[PDB]
Design a protein around this motif. Structure first.
Motif, PDB file in Angstrom:
ATOM      1  N   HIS A  49      33.916  39.306  46.486  1.00  0.00           N
ATOM      2  CA  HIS A  49      33.250  40.952  46.988  1.00  0.00           C
ATOM      3  C   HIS A  49      34.359  41.734  46.496  1.00  0.00           C
ATOM      4  N   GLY A  50      34.583  42.443  44.973  1.00  0.00           N
ATOM      5  CA  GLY A  50      35.238  43.445  44.364  1.00  0.00           C
ATOM      6  C   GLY A  50      35.870  43.260  43.131  1.00  0.00           C
ATOM      7  N   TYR A  51      35.495  41.747  44.100  1.00  0.00           N
ATOM      8  CA  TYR A  51      37.109  41.273  42.799  1.00  0.00           C
ATOM      9  C   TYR A  51      36.633  39.527  41.665  1.00  0.00           C
ATOM     10  N   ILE A  52      35.930  38.857  41.848  1.00  0.00           N
ATOM     11  CA  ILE A  52      35.146  38.033  40.928  1.00  0.00           C
ATOM     12  C   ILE A  52      33.766  39.045  40.704  1.00  0.00           C
ATOM     13  N   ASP A  53      33.347  39.526  41.558  1.00  0.00           N
ATOM     14  CA  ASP A  53      32.190  40.230  40.921  1.00  0.00           C
ATOM     15  C   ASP A  53      31.218  40.879  40.182  1.00  0.00           C
ATOM     16  N   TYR A  54      32.444  41.613  40.329  1.00  0.00           N
ATOM     17  CA  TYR A  54      32.071  42.770  38.722  1.00  0.00           C
ATOM     18  C   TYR A  54      30.716  42.281  37.386  1.00  0.00           C
ATOM     19  N   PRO A  55      30.503  42.470  37.169  1.00  0.00           N
ATOM     20  CA  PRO A  55      29.179  42.467  36.345  1.00  0.00           C
ATOM     21  C   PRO A  55      30.498  42.089  34.932  1.00  0.00           C
ATOM     22  N   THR A  56      29.834  41.700  33.502  1.00  0.00           N
ATOM     23  CA  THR A  56      30.187  41.856  32.515  1.00  0.00           C
ATOM     24  C   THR A  56      28.687  42.621  31.766  1.00  0.00           C
ATOM     25  N   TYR A  57      28.720  43.050  30.808  1.00  0.00           N
ATOM     26  CA  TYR A  57      27.287  44.242  30.291  1.00  0.00           C
ATOM     27  C   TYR A  57      26.739  43.177  30.644  1.00  0.00           C
TER      28      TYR A  57
ATOM     29  N   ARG B 185      43.670  30.131  46.539  1.00  0.00           N
ATOM     30  CA  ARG B 185      42.795  29.069  46.451  1.00  0.00           C
ATOM     31  C   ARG B 185      41.433  28.652  45.792  1.00  0.00           C
ATOM     32  N   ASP B 186      41.000  29.686  46.631  1.00  0.00           N
ATOM     33  CA  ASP B 186      39.828  29.788  46.347  1.00  0.00           C
ATOM     34  C   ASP B 186      39.284  30.811  45.254  1.00  0.00           C
ATOM     35  N   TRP B 187      39.774  31.873  44.228  1.00  0.00           N
ATOM     36  CA  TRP B 187      38.964  33.022  43.190  1.00  0.00           C
ATOM     37  C   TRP B 187      39.493  33.437  42.520  1.00  0.00           C
ATOM     38  N   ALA B 188      41.512  32.825  42.835  1.00  0.00           N
ATOM     39  CA  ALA B 188      42.207  33.368  41.814  1.00  0.00           C
ATOM     40  C   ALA B 188      42.173  33.434  40.301  1.00  0.00           C
ATOM     41  N   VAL B 189      41.958  31.821  40.517  1.00  0.00           N
ATOM     42  CA  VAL B 189      41.569  31.119  39.221  1.00  0.00           C
ATOM     43  C   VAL B 189      40.373  31.969  38.043  1.00  0.00           C
ATOM     44  N   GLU B 190      39.182  32.221  39.122  1.00  0.00           N
ATOM     45  CA  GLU B 190      38.250  32.466  38.545  1.00  0.00           C
ATOM     46  C   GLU B 190      38.053  34.215  38.279  1.00  0.00           C
ATOM     47  N   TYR B 191      38.917  35.088  39.324  1.00  0.00           N
ATOM     48  CA  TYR B 191      39.508  36.285  38.508  1.00  0.00           C
ATOM     49  C   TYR B 191      40.503  36.103  36.899  1.00  0.00           C
ATOM     50  N   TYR B 192      41.442  35.760  37.070  1.00  0.00           N
ATOM     51  CA  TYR B 192      41.532  35.838  35.901  1.00  0.00           C
ATOM     52  C   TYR B 192      41.283  35.202  34.664  1.00  0.00           C
TER      53      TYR B 192
ATOM     54  N   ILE C  68      47.769  49.892  24.842  1.00  0.00           N
ATOM     55  CA  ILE C  68      47.184  50.268  26.009  1.00  0.00           C
ATOM     56  C   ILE C  68      46.930  49.249  26.865  1.00  0.00           C
ATOM     57  N   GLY C  69      47.704  49.580  28.256  1.00  0.00           N
ATOM     58  CA  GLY C  69      47.204  49.079  28.963  1.00  0.00           C
ATOM     59  C   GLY C  69      46.053  49.341  29.939  1.00  0.00           C
ATOM     60  N   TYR C  70      45.424  48.838  30.824  1.00  0.00           N
ATOM     61  CA  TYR C  70      43.771  49.711  31.485  1.00  0.00           C
ATOM     62  C   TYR C  70      44.547  48.513  32.694  1.00  0.00           C
ATOM     63  N   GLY C  71      44.103  49.140  33.609  1.00  0.00           N
ATOM     64  CA  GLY C  71      44.526  48.671  34.881  1.00  0.00           C
ATOM     65  C   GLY C  71      42.312  49.139  35.393  1.00  0.00           C
ATOM     66  N   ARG C  72      42.821  50.580  36.912  1.00  0.00           N
ATOM     67  CA  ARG C  72      41.775  49.774  37.014  1.00  0.00           C
ATOM     68  C   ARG C  72      40.712  49.659  36.576  1.00  0.00           C
ATOM     69  N   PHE C  73      39.854  50.176  35.007  1.00  0.00           N
ATOM     70  CA  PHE C  73      39.015  49.677  34.964  1.00  0.00           C
ATOM     71  C   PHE C  73      38.839  48.150  34.172  1.00  0.00           C
ATOM     72  N   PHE C  74      40.113  47.246  34.434  1.00  0.00           N
ATOM     73  CA  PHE C  74      40.317  46.037  33.996  1.00  0.00           C
ATOM     74  C   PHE C  74      39.842  45.219  35.253  1.00  0.00           C
ATOM     75  N   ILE C  75      40.001  46.243  36.542  1.00  0.00           N
ATOM     76  CA  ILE C  75      39.364  45.271  37.482  1.00  0.00           C
ATOM     77  C   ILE C  75      38.334  45.160  37.799  1.00  0.00           C
ATOM     78  N   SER C  76      37.481  46.520  37.351  1.00  0.00           N
ATOM     79  CA  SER C  76      35.752  46.886  37.722  1.00  0.00           C
ATOM     80  C   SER C  76      35.414  46.230  36.114  1.00  0.00           C
TER      81      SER C  76
END
Ligand SMILES: Cc1cc2nc3c(=O)[nH]c(=O)nc-3n(C[C@H](O)[C@H](O)[C@H](O)COP(=O)(O)O)c2cc1C
Ligand SMILES: COC(=O)/C=C(\C#N)c1ccc(F)cc1
Ligand SMILES: [Mg+2]
Ligand code: NA
Length: 397
Positions: A380-388, A50-57, A344-352
Protein backbone atom coordinates in the motif's frame (compact mmCIF):
# COMPACT_ATOMS: atom_id res chain seq x y z
CA UNK A 1 -7.52 11.14 -5.81
CA UNK A 2 -6.03 13.74 -8.16
CA UNK A 3 -4.27 16.90 -6.95
CA UNK A 4 -6.90 19.62 -6.56
CA UNK A 5 -6.39 23.06 -8.13
CA UNK A 6 -3.41 21.79 -10.16
CA UNK A 7 -3.62 23.08 -13.73
CA UNK A 8 -1.74 20.58 -15.92
CA UNK A 9 0.20 21.62 -18.99
CA UNK A 10 1.16 19.26 -21.83
CA UNK A 11 4.97 19.30 -22.05
CA UNK A 12 5.22 17.14 -25.18
CA UNK A 13 6.17 20.20 -27.22
CA UNK A 14 9.28 20.89 -25.11
CA UNK A 15 12.79 19.47 -24.82
CA UNK A 16 11.49 17.31 -21.96
CA UNK A 17 10.41 15.02 -24.81
CA UNK A 18 13.61 15.19 -26.85
CA UNK A 19 15.93 12.16 -26.67
CA UNK A 20 19.31 12.52 -24.97
CA UNK A 21 22.27 10.22 -24.27
CA UNK A 22 23.37 9.84 -20.65
CA UNK A 23 26.43 7.64 -20.25
CA UNK A 24 25.76 4.54 -22.33
CA UNK A 25 22.00 5.09 -22.30
CA UNK A 26 19.83 6.51 -25.07
CA UNK A 27 17.05 8.16 -23.09
CA UNK A 28 13.86 8.84 -25.05
CA UNK A 29 12.79 11.74 -22.82
CA UNK A 30 14.30 13.82 -20.02
CA UNK A 31 11.98 13.06 -17.09
CA UNK A 32 14.22 11.21 -14.64
CA UNK A 33 13.26 9.23 -11.55
CA UNK A 34 15.54 10.61 -8.84
CA UNK A 35 16.64 8.39 -5.93
CA UNK A 36 13.75 7.72 -3.55
CA UNK A 37 14.25 5.74 -0.35
CA UNK A 38 11.10 3.72 0.40
CA UNK A 39 12.15 1.50 3.34
CA UNK A 40 10.64 -1.75 2.03
CA UNK A 41 13.92 -3.67 2.31
CA UNK A 42 13.78 -6.56 4.74
CA UNK A 43 15.78 -7.26 7.91
CA UNK A 44 18.12 -8.95 8.52
CA UNK A 45 20.60 -8.24 5.76
CA UNK A 46 19.14 -5.10 4.15
CA UNK A 47 17.56 -7.16 1.36
CA UNK A 48 15.60 -5.46 -1.44
CA UNK A 49 11.96 -6.39 -0.92
CA UNK A 50 11.36 -9.91 -2.22
CA UNK A 51 7.60 -9.37 -2.64
CA UNK A 52 7.20 -5.92 -4.16
CA UNK A 53 10.40 -4.22 -5.34
CA UNK A 54 10.45 -5.71 -8.83
CA UNK A 55 6.83 -4.63 -9.35
CA UNK A 56 7.53 -1.12 -8.01
CA UNK A 57 10.39 -0.55 -10.44
CA UNK A 58 8.58 -2.31 -13.29
CA UNK A 59 5.63 0.07 -12.93
CA UNK A 60 7.90 3.11 -12.97
CA UNK A 61 9.95 1.81 -15.92
CA UNK A 62 6.79 1.55 -18.08
CA UNK A 63 7.58 4.50 -20.35
CA UNK A 64 10.26 3.27 -22.75
CA UNK A 65 13.64 4.98 -22.43
CA UNK A 66 13.22 6.29 -18.87
CA UNK A 67 16.28 6.87 -16.69
CA UNK A 68 15.69 5.52 -13.18
CA UNK A 69 18.03 6.22 -10.28
CA UNK A 70 17.43 3.71 -7.48
CA UNK A 71 16.68 4.42 -3.87
CA UNK A 72 19.91 4.89 -1.95
CA UNK A 73 21.78 1.62 -1.44
CA UNK A 74 24.29 1.10 1.37
CA UNK A 75 27.79 0.20 0.18
CA UNK A 76 28.58 -1.78 3.37
CA UNK A 77 27.17 -2.54 6.84
CA UNK A 78 29.27 0.30 8.32
CA UNK A 79 27.72 2.67 5.74
CA UNK A 80 24.19 1.76 6.91
CA UNK A 81 22.08 2.00 10.04
CA UNK A 82 18.51 1.76 8.76
CA UNK A 83 17.21 -1.81 8.91
CA UNK A 84 14.77 -1.35 6.02
CA UNK A 85 16.95 0.33 3.37
CA UNK A 86 18.78 -1.97 0.93
CA UNK A 87 22.48 -2.66 0.49
CA UNK A 88 24.62 -3.64 -2.49
CA UNK A 89 27.45 -5.47 -0.71
CA UNK A 90 26.12 -9.05 -0.39
CA UNK A 91 25.25 -11.89 -2.76
CA UNK A 92 21.81 -12.10 -1.11
CA UNK A 93 21.18 -8.44 -1.96
CA UNK A 94 22.45 -8.71 -5.52
CA UNK A 95 20.12 -11.63 -6.27
CA UNK A 96 17.18 -9.28 -5.75
CA UNK A 97 18.84 -6.31 -7.49
CA UNK A 98 19.48 -8.46 -10.57
CA UNK A 99 15.75 -9.21 -10.82
CA UNK A 100 15.02 -5.49 -10.51
CA UNK A 101 17.52 -4.44 -13.18
CA UNK A 102 16.28 -7.17 -15.53
CA UNK A 103 12.69 -5.98 -15.15
CA UNK A 104 13.62 -2.36 -15.86
CA UNK A 105 15.57 -3.39 -18.95
CA UNK A 106 12.68 -5.57 -20.17
CA UNK A 107 10.65 -2.35 -20.25
CA UNK A 108 13.43 -0.73 -22.31
CA UNK A 109 14.35 1.68 -19.53
CA UNK A 110 17.61 2.26 -17.62
CA UNK A 111 18.80 1.97 -14.04
CA UNK A 112 21.53 3.71 -12.06
CA UNK A 113 22.26 2.63 -8.49
CA UNK A 114 22.64 5.42 -5.97
CA UNK A 115 25.48 4.56 -3.57
CA UNK A 116 24.68 5.67 -0.03
CA UNK A 117 26.66 6.23 3.19
CA UNK A 118 24.72 7.69 6.12
CA UNK A 119 27.32 9.20 8.45
CA UNK A 120 25.55 11.11 11.20
CA UNK A 121 22.09 10.43 9.78
CA UNK A 122 22.33 6.75 10.83
CA UNK A 123 20.68 5.38 13.97
CA UNK A 124 23.50 4.86 16.53
CA UNK A 125 21.55 2.11 18.34
CA UNK A 126 21.19 -0.05 15.22
CA UNK A 127 24.90 0.36 14.56
CA UNK A 128 25.82 -0.48 18.17
CA UNK A 129 23.63 -3.59 18.02
CA UNK A 130 25.64 -4.70 14.97
CA UNK A 131 29.04 -3.78 16.45
CA UNK A 132 29.48 -0.83 14.11
CA UNK A 133 30.72 2.75 14.60
CA UNK A 134 28.60 5.91 14.42
CA UNK A 135 30.55 7.90 11.84
CA UNK A 136 30.93 11.47 10.61
CA UNK A 137 33.54 13.97 9.49
CA UNK A 138 33.93 15.39 13.00
CA UNK A 139 33.21 14.46 16.61
CA UNK A 140 32.42 17.84 18.14
CA UNK A 141 29.38 18.82 16.12
CA UNK A 142 26.25 16.72 15.79
CA UNK A 143 23.20 16.43 13.58
CA UNK A 144 20.95 17.30 16.47
CA UNK A 145 20.73 16.87 20.24
CA UNK A 146 18.65 13.72 19.86
CA UNK A 147 21.22 11.93 17.69
CA UNK A 148 24.07 13.00 20.00
CA UNK A 149 22.16 11.61 22.98
CA UNK A 150 21.18 8.39 21.17
CA UNK A 151 24.85 7.80 20.38
CA UNK A 152 25.89 8.34 23.99
CA UNK A 153 23.16 6.06 25.39
CA UNK A 154 24.28 3.33 23.01
CA UNK A 155 27.93 3.77 23.99
CA UNK A 156 28.43 4.63 20.36
CA UNK A 157 29.64 8.26 20.38
CA UNK A 158 29.90 10.09 17.07
CA UNK A 159 33.30 9.21 15.66
CA UNK A 160 35.54 11.37 13.47
CA UNK A 161 36.85 9.16 10.65
CA UNK A 162 40.54 8.40 10.47
CA UNK A 163 42.30 8.54 7.11
CA UNK A 164 42.44 4.73 7.09
CA UNK A 165 38.69 4.53 7.72
CA UNK A 166 38.09 6.93 4.83
CA UNK A 167 40.18 4.64 2.59
CA UNK A 168 38.10 1.68 3.77
CA UNK A 169 34.90 3.48 2.72
CA UNK A 170 36.49 4.19 -0.66
CA UNK A 171 37.28 0.47 -1.00
CA UNK A 172 33.62 -0.25 -0.25
CA UNK A 173 32.41 2.34 -2.77
CA UNK A 174 34.56 0.65 -5.40
CA UNK A 175 33.27 -2.82 -4.60
CA UNK A 176 29.65 -1.62 -4.46
CA UNK A 177 30.00 0.02 -7.88
CA UNK A 178 31.51 -3.19 -9.27
CA UNK A 179 28.70 -5.23 -7.71
CA UNK A 180 26.11 -2.94 -9.26
CA UNK A 181 27.53 -3.12 -12.78
CA UNK A 182 28.07 -6.90 -12.58
CA UNK A 183 24.43 -7.38 -11.56
CA UNK A 184 23.28 -5.44 -14.63
CA UNK A 185 23.01 -1.77 -13.65
CA UNK A 186 23.71 0.89 -16.29
CA UNK A 187 25.76 3.03 -13.91
CA UNK A 188 25.97 4.42 -10.39
CA UNK A 189 25.25 7.78 -8.77
CA UNK A 190 27.58 8.89 -5.99
CA UNK A 191 25.38 10.51 -3.35
CA UNK A 192 27.17 13.61 -2.06
CA UNK A 193 23.98 15.50 -1.14
CA UNK A 194 21.21 15.79 1.43
CA UNK A 195 23.44 15.85 4.50
CA UNK A 196 24.72 12.29 4.39
CA UNK A 197 28.39 11.31 4.86
CA UNK A 198 30.03 12.91 1.81
CA UNK A 199 27.93 16.05 2.33
CA UNK A 200 29.06 16.07 5.98
CA UNK A 201 32.62 16.41 4.66
CA UNK A 202 31.74 19.12 2.11
CA UNK A 203 29.96 21.34 4.62
CA UNK A 204 31.96 23.55 7.02
CA UNK A 205 29.30 23.24 9.73
CA UNK A 206 29.67 19.48 9.93
CA UNK A 207 33.36 19.40 9.02
CA UNK A 208 35.61 20.93 11.66
CA UNK A 209 38.59 18.73 10.80
CA UNK A 210 42.08 20.19 10.73
CA UNK A 211 43.72 17.47 8.63
CA UNK A 212 43.78 17.24 4.83
CA UNK A 213 40.06 16.40 4.79
CA UNK A 214 38.88 19.69 6.28
CA UNK A 215 39.62 23.34 6.92
CA UNK A 216 39.48 24.61 3.34
CA UNK A 217 37.39 24.29 0.18
CA UNK A 218 39.83 21.88 -1.45
CA UNK A 219 40.16 19.80 1.72
CA UNK A 220 36.40 19.54 2.33
CA UNK A 221 35.94 18.35 -1.26
CA UNK A 222 38.74 15.78 -1.00
CA UNK A 223 36.68 12.73 0.07
CA UNK A 224 33.97 13.30 -2.57
CA UNK A 225 36.56 13.69 -5.33
CA UNK A 226 38.49 10.62 -4.13
CA UNK A 227 35.29 8.60 -4.49
CA UNK A 228 34.65 10.08 -7.93
CA UNK A 229 38.17 9.19 -9.05
CA UNK A 230 38.08 5.69 -7.55
CA UNK A 231 34.81 4.87 -9.30
CA UNK A 232 35.86 6.39 -12.62
CA UNK A 233 38.93 4.14 -12.50
CA UNK A 234 36.89 1.10 -11.47
CA UNK A 235 33.95 1.19 -13.88
CA UNK A 236 34.52 4.18 -16.15
CA UNK A 237 33.39 7.83 -16.23
CA UNK A 238 30.49 6.97 -18.55
CA UNK A 239 28.97 4.87 -15.74
CA UNK A 240 29.33 7.44 -12.94
CA UNK A 241 27.27 10.48 -11.93
CA UNK A 242 27.43 12.76 -8.87
CA UNK A 243 24.58 14.22 -6.79
CA UNK A 244 24.88 17.55 -4.92
CA UNK A 245 22.47 19.83 -3.03
CA UNK A 246 24.28 23.16 -2.59
CA UNK A 247 21.40 24.89 -0.79
CA UNK A 248 20.10 21.91 1.18
CA UNK A 249 19.55 22.19 4.94
CA UNK A 250 18.17 18.66 5.47
CA UNK A 251 20.27 16.71 7.99
CA UNK A 252 21.74 19.94 9.40
CA UNK A 253 23.66 21.16 6.38
CA UNK A 254 24.39 24.89 6.09
CA UNK A 255 22.60 25.98 2.91
CA UNK A 256 22.68 29.61 1.83
CA UNK A 257 23.33 30.90 5.36
CA UNK A 258 26.94 29.81 4.77
CA UNK A 259 28.42 32.57 2.62
CA UNK A 260 31.07 30.17 1.34
CA UNK A 261 28.58 27.58 0.13
CA UNK A 262 28.52 28.53 -3.56
CA UNK A 263 32.33 28.58 -3.65
CA UNK A 264 32.44 25.09 -2.11
CA UNK A 265 30.18 23.65 -4.80
CA UNK A 266 31.71 25.72 -7.60
CA UNK A 267 35.04 24.15 -6.71
CA UNK A 268 33.59 20.64 -7.03
CA UNK A 269 31.99 21.48 -10.40
CA UNK A 270 35.30 22.95 -11.56
CA UNK A 271 37.21 19.81 -10.60
CA UNK A 272 34.66 17.70 -12.49
CA UNK A 273 35.03 19.86 -15.62
CA UNK A 274 38.83 19.66 -15.30
CA UNK A 275 38.56 15.86 -15.39
CA UNK A 276 36.12 16.07 -18.30
CA UNK A 277 38.47 18.22 -20.34
CA UNK A 278 41.25 15.72 -19.54
CA UNK A 279 39.12 12.95 -21.08
CA UNK A 280 37.06 11.60 -18.19
CA UNK A 281 33.68 13.36 -18.19
CA UNK A 282 31.12 12.05 -15.71
CA UNK A 283 27.83 10.94 -17.23
CA UNK A 284 25.96 13.68 -15.35
CA UNK A 285 25.77 16.02 -12.39
CA UNK A 286 22.49 15.80 -10.46
CA UNK A 287 21.44 18.85 -8.46
CA UNK A 288 18.75 19.32 -5.86
CA UNK A 289 17.28 22.79 -6.40
CA UNK A 290 16.94 25.52 -3.75
CA UNK A 291 13.22 25.03 -4.54
CA UNK A 292 13.38 22.19 -1.99
CA UNK A 293 15.88 22.58 0.86
CA UNK A 294 14.19 19.76 2.78
CA UNK A 295 12.25 17.06 0.88
CA UNK A 296 10.02 16.29 3.87
CA UNK A 297 8.39 19.70 3.75
CA UNK A 298 5.31 20.12 1.54
CA UNK A 299 5.96 21.60 -1.91
CA UNK A 300 6.39 25.36 -1.59
CA UNK A 301 7.81 25.18 1.94
CA UNK A 302 11.51 25.47 2.72
CA UNK A 303 12.13 27.27 -0.57
CA UNK A 304 15.33 29.30 -0.54
CA UNK A 305 15.03 32.34 -2.78
CA UNK A 306 18.49 33.76 -2.10
CA UNK A 307 20.38 31.38 -4.36
CA UNK A 308 20.34 29.69 -7.75
CA UNK A 309 22.07 26.57 -9.06
CA UNK A 310 22.62 28.33 -12.40
CA UNK A 311 26.28 28.91 -11.44
CA UNK A 312 26.95 25.24 -12.09
CA UNK A 313 26.24 25.71 -15.79
CA UNK A 314 29.04 28.29 -16.10
CA UNK A 315 31.46 25.63 -14.87
CA UNK A 316 30.32 22.08 -15.66
CA UNK A 317 29.55 21.61 -19.33
CA UNK A 318 27.92 18.17 -19.27
CA UNK A 319 24.38 16.99 -18.63
CA UNK A 320 22.62 18.37 -15.55
CA UNK A 321 19.64 16.74 -13.86
CA UNK A 322 17.68 19.18 -11.68
CA UNK A 323 15.19 18.07 -9.05
CA UNK A 324 12.81 19.86 -6.71
CA UNK A 325 9.11 20.74 -6.87
CA UNK A 326 8.87 20.50 -10.66
CA UNK A 327 5.77 18.28 -11.00
CA UNK A 328 3.42 21.02 -9.81
CA UNK A 329 5.26 23.62 -11.88
CA UNK A 330 5.25 22.78 -15.60
CA UNK A 331 5.64 26.51 -16.27
CA UNK A 332 9.07 26.37 -14.61
CA UNK A 333 10.05 23.14 -16.38
CA UNK A 334 9.07 24.65 -19.75
CA UNK A 335 11.67 27.35 -19.18
CA UNK A 336 14.41 25.16 -17.71
CA UNK A 337 14.39 22.55 -20.49
CA UNK A 338 15.06 25.25 -23.07
CA UNK A 339 18.61 24.53 -22.01
CA UNK A 340 19.57 21.57 -24.17
CA UNK A 341 21.58 19.65 -21.56
CA UNK A 342 18.99 19.90 -18.75
CA UNK A 343 16.96 16.93 -17.46
CA UNK A 344 14.28 17.10 -14.77
CA UNK A 345 14.00 14.75 -11.81
CA UNK A 346 10.51 14.20 -10.44
CA UNK A 347 10.56 12.62 -6.97
CA UNK A 348 7.42 12.66 -4.86
CA UNK A 349 5.09 12.61 -7.85
CA UNK A 350 6.86 9.57 -9.34
CA UNK A 351 6.05 7.85 -6.05
CA UNK A 352 2.35 8.48 -6.66
CA UNK A 353 2.24 8.33 -10.50
CA UNK A 354 3.80 5.24 -12.08
CA UNK A 355 2.87 6.65 -15.51
CA UNK A 356 4.11 10.15 -14.68
CA UNK A 357 5.88 10.51 -18.03
CA UNK A 358 2.64 10.01 -20.02
CA UNK A 359 0.94 12.52 -17.73
CA UNK A 360 3.68 15.11 -18.30
CA UNK A 361 3.62 14.65 -22.09
CA UNK A 362 -0.16 14.87 -22.33
CA UNK A 363 -0.97 17.36 -19.56
CA UNK A 364 -2.99 14.96 -17.40
CA UNK A 365 -4.06 15.30 -13.75
CA UNK A 366 -1.63 13.93 -11.16
CA UNK A 367 -2.35 11.44 -8.40
CA UNK A 368 -1.94 12.97 -4.96
CA UNK A 369 0.80 11.29 -2.94
CA UNK A 370 0.36 9.87 0.56
CA UNK A 371 3.37 10.93 2.63
CA UNK A 372 2.37 8.52 5.40
CA UNK A 373 3.42 5.60 3.20
CA UNK A 374 6.65 7.10 1.83
CA UNK A 375 8.40 4.94 4.42
CA UNK A 376 6.26 1.95 5.35
CA UNK A 377 6.58 -1.83 5.18
CA UNK A 378 3.67 -2.14 2.78
CA UNK A 379 2.58 -2.66 -0.80
CA UNK A 380 0.00 0.00 0.00
CA UNK A 381 1.36 3.39 -1.03
CA UNK A 382 4.11 1.61 -2.96
CA UNK A 383 2.67 -0.49 -5.80
CA UNK A 384 -1.03 0.37 -5.68
CA UNK A 385 -1.01 3.90 -7.04
CA UNK A 386 -3.02 3.74 -10.30
CA UNK A 387 -2.07 4.73 -13.81
CA UNK A 388 -4.27 7.42 -15.33
CA UNK A 389 -6.41 4.74 -17.04
CA UNK A 390 -6.87 2.88 -13.75
CA UNK A 391 -7.66 6.12 -11.92
CA UNK A 392 -10.42 6.98 -14.40
CA UNK A 393 -11.90 3.50 -13.94
CA UNK A 394 -11.88 4.06 -10.17
CA UNK A 395 -13.79 7.28 -10.81
CA UNK A 396 -11.05 9.66 -9.66
CA UNK A 397 -12.12 12.24 -12.23
C1 LIG B 1 10.47 9.74 0.51
C2 LIG B 1 11.72 10.34 -0.09
C3 LIG B 1 12.87 9.58 -0.22
C4 LIG B 1 14.02 10.11 -0.78
N1 LIG B 1 15.16 9.34 -0.90
C5 LIG B 1 16.31 9.87 -1.46
C6 LIG B 1 17.46 9.11 -1.61
O1 LIG B 1 17.50 7.92 -1.26
N2 LIG B 1 18.58 9.69 -2.17
C7 LIG B 1 18.56 11.00 -2.60
O2 LIG B 1 19.57 11.49 -3.10
N3 LIG B 1 17.42 11.76 -2.46
C8 LIG B 1 16.30 11.20 -1.91
N4 LIG B 1 15.16 11.97 -1.78
C9 LIG B 1 15.18 13.39 -2.32
C10 LIG B 1 14.57 13.33 -3.75
O3 LIG B 1 15.40 12.62 -4.67
C11 LIG B 1 14.26 14.70 -4.37
O4 LIG B 1 15.47 15.43 -4.51
C12 LIG B 1 13.26 15.51 -3.55
O5 LIG B 1 12.16 14.70 -3.16
C13 LIG B 1 12.79 16.76 -4.31
O6 LIG B 1 12.17 16.43 -5.54
P1 LIG B 1 10.57 16.41 -5.65
O7 LIG B 1 10.04 17.76 -5.21
O8 LIG B 1 10.29 16.16 -7.11
O9 LIG B 1 10.07 15.28 -4.75
C14 LIG B 1 14.02 11.44 -1.22
C15 LIG B 1 12.87 12.20 -1.10
C16 LIG B 1 11.71 11.66 -0.53
C17 LIG B 1 10.46 12.48 -0.39
C1 LIG C 1 20.00 4.11 1.89
O1 LIG C 1 19.83 5.48 1.52
C2 LIG C 1 18.97 6.13 2.33
O2 LIG C 1 18.49 5.67 3.37
C3 LIG C 1 18.65 7.52 1.82
C4 LIG C 1 17.67 8.45 2.51
C5 LIG C 1 17.02 8.06 3.72
N1 LIG C 1 16.49 7.77 4.69
C6 LIG C 1 17.45 9.73 1.99
C7 LIG C 1 18.44 10.36 1.24
C8 LIG C 1 18.22 11.63 0.74
C9 LIG C 1 17.02 12.27 1.01
F1 LIG C 1 16.79 13.51 0.52
C10 LIG C 1 16.04 11.65 1.76
C11 LIG C 1 16.25 10.38 2.26
MG1 LIG D 1 14.44 9.72 -18.50
NA1 NA E 1 11.51 8.38 9.35
Amino acid sequence: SFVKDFKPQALGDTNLFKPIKIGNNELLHRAVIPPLTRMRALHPGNIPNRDWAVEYYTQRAQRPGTMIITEGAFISPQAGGYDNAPGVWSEEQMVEWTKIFNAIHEKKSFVWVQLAVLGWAAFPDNLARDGLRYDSASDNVFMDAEQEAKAKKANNPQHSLTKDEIKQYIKEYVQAAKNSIAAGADGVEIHSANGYLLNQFLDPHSNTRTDEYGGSIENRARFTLEVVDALVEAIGHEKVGLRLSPYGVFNSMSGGAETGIVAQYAYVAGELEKRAKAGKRLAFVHLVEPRVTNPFLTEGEGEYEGGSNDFVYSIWKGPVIRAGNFALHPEVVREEVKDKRTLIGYGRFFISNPDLVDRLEKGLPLNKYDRDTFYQMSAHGYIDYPTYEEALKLGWD
